[PDB]
Amino acid sequence: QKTDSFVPRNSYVRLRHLCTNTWIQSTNVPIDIEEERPIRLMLGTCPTKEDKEA
Amino acid sequence: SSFLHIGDIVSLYAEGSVNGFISTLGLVDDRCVVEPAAGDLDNPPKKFRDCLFKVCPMNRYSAQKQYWKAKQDVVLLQKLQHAAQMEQKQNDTENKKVHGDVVKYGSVIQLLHMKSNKYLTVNKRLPALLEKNAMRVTLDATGNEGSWLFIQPFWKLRSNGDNVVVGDKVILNPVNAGQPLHASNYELSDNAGCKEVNSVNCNTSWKINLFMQFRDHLEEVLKGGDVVRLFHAEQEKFLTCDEYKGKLQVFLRTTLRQSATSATSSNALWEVEVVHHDPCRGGAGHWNGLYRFKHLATGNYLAAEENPSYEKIKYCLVAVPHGNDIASLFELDPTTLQKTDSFVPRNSYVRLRHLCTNTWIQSTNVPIDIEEERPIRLMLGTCPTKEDKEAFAIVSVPVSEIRDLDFANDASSMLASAVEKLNEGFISQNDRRFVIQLLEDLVFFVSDVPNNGQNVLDIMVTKPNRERQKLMREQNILKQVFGILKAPFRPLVRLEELSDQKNAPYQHMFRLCYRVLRHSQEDYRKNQEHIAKQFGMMQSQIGYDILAEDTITALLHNNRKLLEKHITKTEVETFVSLVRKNREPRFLDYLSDLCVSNH
Amino acid sequence: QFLQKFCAGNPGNQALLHKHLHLFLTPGLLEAETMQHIFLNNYQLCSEISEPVLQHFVHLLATHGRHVQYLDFLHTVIKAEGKYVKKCQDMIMTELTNAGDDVVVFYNDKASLAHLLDMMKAARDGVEDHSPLMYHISLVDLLAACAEGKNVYTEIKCTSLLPLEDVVSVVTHEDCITEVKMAYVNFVNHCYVDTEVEMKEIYTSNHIWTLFENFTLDMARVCSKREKRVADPTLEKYVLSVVLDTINAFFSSPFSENSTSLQTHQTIVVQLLQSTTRLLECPWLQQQHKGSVEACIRTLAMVAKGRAILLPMDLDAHISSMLSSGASDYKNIIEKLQDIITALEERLKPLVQAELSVLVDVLHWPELLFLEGSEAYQRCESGGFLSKLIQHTKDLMESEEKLCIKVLRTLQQMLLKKTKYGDRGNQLRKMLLQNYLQDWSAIAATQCRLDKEGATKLVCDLITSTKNEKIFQESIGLAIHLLDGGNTEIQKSFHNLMMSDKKSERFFKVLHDRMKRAQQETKSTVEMGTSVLIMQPILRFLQLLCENHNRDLQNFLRCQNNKTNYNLVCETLQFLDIMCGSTTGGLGLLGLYINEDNVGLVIQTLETLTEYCQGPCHENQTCIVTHESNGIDIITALILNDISPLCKYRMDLVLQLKDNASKLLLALMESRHDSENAERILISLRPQELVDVIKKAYLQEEERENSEVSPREVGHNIYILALQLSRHNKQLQHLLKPV
Ligand SMILES: O=P(O)(O)O[C@@H]1[C@H](O)[C@H](O)[C@@H](OP(=O)(O)O)[C@H](OP(=O)(O)O)[C@H]1O
C-alpha cells in the first residue's frame, strides 16, 4: 500500500495481538466434540506469522 | 515488496509434497529436478545458478512450427524460412516493447533458465521418464507452444486481474497441458537425492522469490552473481586459484606472452555475490557494500588468514570452502571520484579491503613454488596500510567461455567418479553406458562439429579450436582420460581379452578415450607435450585394436622435437614386430608416415 | 425382463422408455441391465447422455463394490451402432482416473499376478458369469475401447496402468485363458501400436515379437485341434480376428522400417507367413475371414519384399503364386396403404402452409375478430393481443420451450415477405381469411409496430438469459429480421435499450463468449461444427445493426460505457485470422485451409468488418489495423495469393472474396490522412506483387462469362487502393505510372 493511508474497505488484513505479540490463526479442532455435526471451529493465536491466514 | 515485472530474475521454490528449488542438471541433459537436500529458503543451495529463471512474455511459434514440419517446392521452403525470420524479429520487437510491464494473475508467462538459456517447456505427447501417467517437462532452447504457462492464484486472497507480488505462492498451468507442474517423489536413479518435475494434477505451490529486478539487469553494471576476472594493473597478471601440492592456493600467475591481457585461463574466473539481508536476493552492487567472491572451478571462497611468516605482511589470502564465515567479506573502494554512491561501473579499477581485520590487499614478489624451475605463482597478502598503486581491474568474461566451463566442470566430475569406480574394481552396465555417452559427448564438444549421427570413432574437423583445447587440458579432463586408460590394466580387463566379446564394450570405451586424446593435440604445442609426457603408456598398449598407433602418429605427425625424442630403436622394433604379426598394410602406411614429417 | 424385451431393437420404444428414466436411476443390478438395454445400439441417446448418469454409476461402482453390469453398461454407452462417442469416452476415463485404485484394479504386481493365476485356474474350464476375472476382463476391454479415441493423455494413462512387461508375462505364461489373451491383445492393438506418442516403445521393442511367436503357437494349437476335432470357438475367433488385426497393424505402420534387424525376427516373420498360408489352405476359413486373412497376407508380403528377406525358394514362389491369384392380401393391403399415405402427404403439402399463413395474418389483425365498439376491440386496436403475447413469451420461456420457439418463429414469419403457395393454396387461404376475418414499406411498418409493441425488449431478454440453443438461434433470427433493410428506428431503439438497461454487460457478455467458443472450436478443428454454424447469424446481426453508417452503434460495439468493456470488432478480426490459418496461411498456405464449406462465413466476416470500418469510423480503423494478433496481413494475403485449390473448380467465389477484401482495405483507408495505416498495410503488401496482381486481373477479365462479378472492378478497386497507398511510398508511385 502507498505510504500509510486510510485502510480501504473490503480489503484482506491480518490481526496481531499487541500484548503477547502473536498472530491470529484458525484451528481444525471442534469445540462441541460432544455434539453431532460440529459447526464451531476453535481459533487461537500462534507466535509465528502465516501469510495464508487473512 | 513489489510486483513481478517482466524481466525480473526469480527463484521458484517448490513447497508441497517435496520442498526445494527447481534446479536442472548440467551438460546436454534437459531434465529438471527439485533437490530438497541442497537447502531451503533460509539456507540457499551452494550452486545458486541453476535455480534462476527469467519471466518473459508471450512468444508465437506458428510459422516456426510449420517450418519445422517442412524440414521434417524450394521456393515454398524459402518463403517459409523468411516467414520464420520475420516472425522471430517481430517476437523480439514485441519483447522489447513489453519489457518492464507487470504480470497479472491469469496472464501468460514463460520461464527461461538463465544458465542454460532454455525455456521450461511442457510436452503433452510424451510421458514422463519415471511417472508414465504424467506428461513430459523439459528444457528447449528454441521453445515451443508448451513453454506457455498461466500463472494462477494458489491463495484465495488474489483473483484474476490482480497484480502478482514477490514472495507469494502461485500455480503454473501450461497452456496446452492444462495440468499444473508437480514435484513428484520419484527419485532419479542417475543422481541421488533428485526428484522429478512433471505436469500432472497436484496441489503444489510454487513460491516465487526474487533475486534481481528488471531495472538492475543493465549490462553496464557489476551485478550480483556476475562472473569476472581480477586483473592486476601494476603486475599485469590475472588472479588465479589452483591445486598445487594437495591444498588449493590463490596466487598471481605469470605469463611470458607479449600481451598479458591475453593470458586468459578458466581457473581465474570469479563470481561476485552481493551480501544482502535476504539470502536469496542479489541485485546490483554499490560502492558502500559488502561483496563475496566464489570460484566456479572448485566452488571455494577467497578469504584471508594469519600468515606464519610474520614477513612484512600479516595475513595472506587463501581459499576456504565455507562461505558463511565473516572472514570472506570484502569491501570495494574506488580509485577515482564517482558521483554520490551509485552502481559500480563495469571494467573499473577497484581496491579490496577486508572487513574483519581492516587490511588492504597487496601483491608480493615471493614465489610460492621456490622448489620449482621457472616460478609462475606470486604470493598475495594483506597489509594494514593503503597503497594507491595497487588496484584490481574487474574484467568481464564472455558468456560463451562460461558455457564451456560449465559444460566441462560437470563432465570432469563424472569422469573422476568413473576413474575411482574403475580403480575400486566394480562397475555396472548402466554406469558403463553413461560413461560412454559422456566420452562421445566430450569428443563432440572438443571437435565442436554439430552432431549428425556419424561414427563416434570417425569425425572430420577443419579448424581446430584453441580455447576449447586449453579448457580441455586445464580442467584435468585429459588426466581423467589417462586414468581411465591406465587403471583397468592394473585386473578387471586384459589387453588380450579385449578381443573376447565379454570385454568388447571396454575396448570400445578405450577407443573413445584415445580419440579424446587426438583432437586436443592439433596445432597446439602445449597439449601435444602434455599428452606425450606419458608416451610410455601409449607405447605399451600399442598393437591392439585401441587406435593407439593412430594417436601416436597424429601426435608426432607435425612436432619434430617429439618426433626425434619418442622415435628410437625400441619403438621402431615394436612397429616391425607388429607388422610381422598382423601383415597388414595399414602399419606399413603408419611407418611411411613416420618416416617423413611436414613434407 | 418384459421391459427389456419391449425396448430391444426399436429406437422409438427405447426413447419412450428412456423418457421415464427416474425409475431406473437407482441402485440395483436389474435396473442397470434394463437401462443398458435401453441405451443399446442407438446413437442419439448415447451422444446426448447426461454426465450425471455416468458420474452416479461410477460412484455406485466405487461404493457398492465391483460388478460387471456397470462396466458392460459403460462399454455399450461408449460404442453405438458401430461409431464411438468421444464425449462419453472422455467422461468415463476421467471418472475412472479420479475414482482411485479401488474402482480400477490392475494386477501388475508379483503377488497380484499370482492371484490372477489362482483365479484363472479356478476357471480353467470357462469364465464364470460373475467373478473378479470377468471384472478385470471387462475393465481391460473398456479401457481399450476408450483408448481407441485420439486422446494422448488417455493413451498415456492406459500405458501406465498396464506396462508391456505385464502383458508379456501374462500372455506368454505357460497357461493362459482365451479371454485374457483376447482382452490383452485388443488392449495392445488399441493402446500401443496406434498412438500419438512419439516414443512408441512397442515399435522399438522385442516384446511384440514374443507376442507374435505366441500367436503362431496359438494358431498351431487351433490347426491341431481341428485336425483332431478339438475345435475351440474362442481360440478360433481370437486367432482369426485379433491376432491378424494386431499383426497387420504392427507390420503396416511406417515406423517399423528399422525394427526388423535380427535374423530371429526374420524367422518369426517366416513362421507367421507360413502360418497364414496354412490358415488359408484349409477350407474351414470363411469368406469374410478369407478377406481379412488375404489382406494380412498381402501386408506381410509387402513387408517381406521391402525388407528383401530371402525366404525359402519353394514357399517364396508359393506366396508369389497366392499374391498373383488374389490380385487376379395382408401384404398387399399394407403396400396400398403406404401408397395412399404418401400420395395424401404429397397432395396436402401446400394446404398446411396456407393454414400457417392465415394464422400469421389473424395474429396480425386481432381486432377484426371482435365486434366494433367493444372494449376488447379498443384494446386490440392499440396493442392488445400482440402486446400480451410478447410480454408473456418471456414469462413462459422456462415453463414451455416449444411454445416459446413457436411464438418466436411465427413472429419471424410475420416480418417476412408474402409469397404464393398455389392456386389451391390461394383459394383455401381466401376461404379461411374471409370466414375467420370480415414492398419494403410494409416490412418497415411491421418492424416499427413491433418496436412500439416491445419486441426489442423480448429479444434482448431472450439472448441475455436463455440456456436453450434453439431459443437463442430463433431470437437472433428475430433480431436479424427486425433489423433487415437497415431500419434507422429499430437500431435506435436497440441502442437505447443497451445504453439504458440494468443488464447491460450481460447481452454483450453472451455474444462475446459465444464468439470466443467459436474461435476455440475453429482452432481445434484445424461438414462444419455446431459452434461455427451459429456464427453466421451473429455476424449478420452485427452487420445489420451497424448498417447505414450508424456512428453511435459502431462506437458502442467497439467499446461500451459500462464498468466492464467488451470489444467485438477485434474478436471478429481474431476469428478471421484463426479461420484463415494466421501467419502460415498468409504466407501462401491460405488456399489449403479455405474450402467451399467455409467460404460463405469468410465473406460474411469480411462484410461485417468493412461495415465496422465504414462511416468512416476512426477508432474501429485503428483497432483493426493496430491489432495485437496482426490479423491485417491475412486481409492482404486474400488479394495477393490466389486460392489454388478453389480456383480450379470454383472461380465466382474467389473473385467475390477478393472483391470483399479490396472493399475492406479501402474502407480501412477511407479517410486516413496519417501514415501509420499506410506503413502497416504496405509492410504486408509488396508493391511489385500488387502491380503484378493488377495486371493479372486485367488479363484474367476474360472469364467474365461464368462470373457475375467481373474481374475488372476488383482490379480497379485494387488500383484505387494502390493509388491511396502510393502517397507514402515513392517506389509504389513510380511503378504505378504507365510505361
Ligand atoms: O606460441 P607457442 O610456441 O605455443 O608458446 C606459447 C607461449 O610461449 C607459452 O608456451 C604459453 O603461455 P604460458 O607462458 O602462459 O604457459 C602458451 O600457451 P597458453 O595458451 O597456455 O598461454 C603457448 O601457446
PDB file of C-alpha atoms in Angstrom, chain A residues 17-22:
ATOM      1  CA  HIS A  17      -2.109  -9.010  19.409  1.00  0.00           C
ATOM      2  CA  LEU A  18      -0.136  -6.177  20.998  1.00  0.00           C
ATOM      3  CA  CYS A  19       0.338  -7.670  24.465  1.00  0.00           C
ATOM      4  CA  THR A  20       1.710 -11.105  23.538  1.00  0.00           C
ATOM      5  CA  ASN A  21       2.984 -10.314  20.011  1.00  0.00           C
ATOM      6  CA  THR A  22       1.069 -13.188  18.434  1.00  0.00           C
TER       7      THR A  22
END
